[PDB]
Amino acid sequence: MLKRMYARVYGLVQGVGFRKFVQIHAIRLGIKGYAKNLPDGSVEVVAEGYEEALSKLLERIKQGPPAAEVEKVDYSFSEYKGEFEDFETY
Ligand SMILES: [Cl-]
């Protein structure tokens, strides 16, 4: 059913089109949430949507855009909270 997924992404992922990439793929799957740069150069993605869509997004996130180098994605799922009206990047 509907879940929230948290993913923290490590690698070369800031400055490289990653957040926009996430966003575009989240929109195509009807997923809401955000992606945010963190102070250590990692990117946090919070996504809410159906589990199968969240799994497809996570397969894209493990892939990343051309300039990026996604080395590790630590992710969990948890209860859907319905906090988001769109997918934003911060
Ligand atoms: Cl797609």
From Swiss-Prot:
Similarity-based family: Belongs to the acylphosphatase family.
Presence of keyword Cell cycle: no
Domain Acylphosphatase-like residues, every copy: 4-90
pH dependence: Optimum pH is 4.7-5.7.
UniProt protein name: Acylphosphatase
PROSITE patterns given in the database record: ACYLPHOSPHATASE_1 (PS00150), ACYLPHOSPHATASE_2 (PS00151), ACYLPHOSPHATASE_3 (PS51160)
Keyword Hydrolase listed: yes
EC top class, as a word: hydrolase
Dependence of activity on temperature: Optimum temperature is 81 degrees Celsius. Thermostable up to 100.8 degrees Celsius. Poorly active at 25 degrees Celsius. Enzymatic activity is increased 4-fold by temperature increase from 25 to 45 degrees Celsius and more than 9-fold at 98 degrees Celsius.
Record key words, sorted: Hydrolase
Gene encoding the protein: acyP
